[PDB]
């Protein structure tokens, strides 16, 4: 999805495996705020939210708490106390095509800043001046959205990057979603120290 229309997917009632993602050895960025990524398996939450989009390579550092910028103010803003992980990797061969890709758009102007975790799909003509636009684009009346152009020869800084944000939630609930547990083959006829579930 585009940055101005970032998609959401809730995940619950299953057994996650964070170590495989940790050791994929293919992602470019992996920052987890407030949680140990190597100890994520030894934790158990109620549900997780996954959000994905494609943005500019040079904008990847606006996806963080306490970030100021056009993306942080008009498209996608994270709360200052956000707990979870941010992942991003290059998509040169998949998203950048000869002639450019115009299927990805980003918002330019907005009347007010964005709170954490909401979307803006409206496309009403912005009113920069003190005169109503009345549906015609011109002086002091600009369209709110334009599109990126992804050319193969572009620099890595302007190369597209795919970004996924995982956010974990905690609430009074069964807290179903969390990682697995390992098991050893049983031994019999000896003094052993056992652990069967609890």
């Amino acid at each position, epitope marked *: 999805a585009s940055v101005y229309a970032w998609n959401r997917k809730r995940i619950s009632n299953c057994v996650a495996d964070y170590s495989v993602l940790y050791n994929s050895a293919s992602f470019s960025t992996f920052k987890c705020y407030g949680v140990s990524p190597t100890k994520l398996n030894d934790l158990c939450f109620t549900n997780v939210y996954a959000d994905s989009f494609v943005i500019r390579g040079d904008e990847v550092r606006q996806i963080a708490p306490g970030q100021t910028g056009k993306i942080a103010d008009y498209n996608y803003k994270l709360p200052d106390d956000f707990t979870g992980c941010v992942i991003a990797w290059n998509s040169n061969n998949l998203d950048s095509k000869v002639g450019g890709n115009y299927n990805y758009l980003y918002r*330019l102007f907005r009347k007010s800043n964005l709170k954490p975790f909401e979307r803006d799909i409206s496309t009403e003509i912005y009113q920069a001046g003190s005169t109503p636009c009345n549906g015609v684009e011109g002086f002091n009346c*600009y369209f709110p959205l334009q599109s990126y152009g992804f050319q193969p020869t572009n620099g890595v800084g302007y190369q597209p990057y795919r970004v996924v944000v995982l956010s974990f939630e905690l609430l009074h609930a069964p807290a179903t979603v969390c990682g697995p547990k390992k098991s050893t083959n049983l031994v019999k006829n000896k003094c052993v120290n056992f652990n069967f579930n609890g």
Partner: antibody
Amino acid sequence: QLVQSGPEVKKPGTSVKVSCKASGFTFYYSAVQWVRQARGQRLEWLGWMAVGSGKANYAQKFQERLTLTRDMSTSTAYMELSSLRSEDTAVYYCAAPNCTGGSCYDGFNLWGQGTVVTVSS
Amino acid sequence: EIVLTQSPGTLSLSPGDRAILSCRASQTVNSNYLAWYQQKPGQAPRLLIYGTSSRATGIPDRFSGSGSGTDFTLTISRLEPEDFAVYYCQQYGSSPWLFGQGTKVEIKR
């Protein structure tokens, strides 16, 4: 306030680039129009461009020779005009409104100091 | 397109009197995209009236715009020596923002 580049003298059959730098106001929400005037003549309109998205509009006479660009790093607008002739010798001005925030002034109150361009041999 | 013409070419008026300037268009022009600019020899133009009715910042009250539709008028109530320049009328509603030929105001003796 707007600051333009210095005057210049070029040769026919070439291209010239003129810079208009802006400071002291929100350059993100503004828009720049270019007006040239000969010696003791009437003002002639060339085109305009919205800095926010880079979209530009040109007059029909200079449709295929005039190109307007911008850079957000230095808040500067650029004219490039190719295949100059003798009659192109004139003074150029960049005009843009005063933007303080989302709202902006409804007129081109801010004007540059002009740039002198002479084309001859 | 839209063509703007200033009917009074040059006016030789002694200071004190009332000065009138007229700008006329071929087609209807939006009343929210008209402006008057004052230019002296050797200086960049200065905005005087915008929006066909309201004046700019710091412009004295004596200047007054009026009219709507195909006709627009600029009025100077009393002349002062620094008010002799060339005045242009511009519209920026359509795509070509054509100017006017201009009117020169000089003293009379």
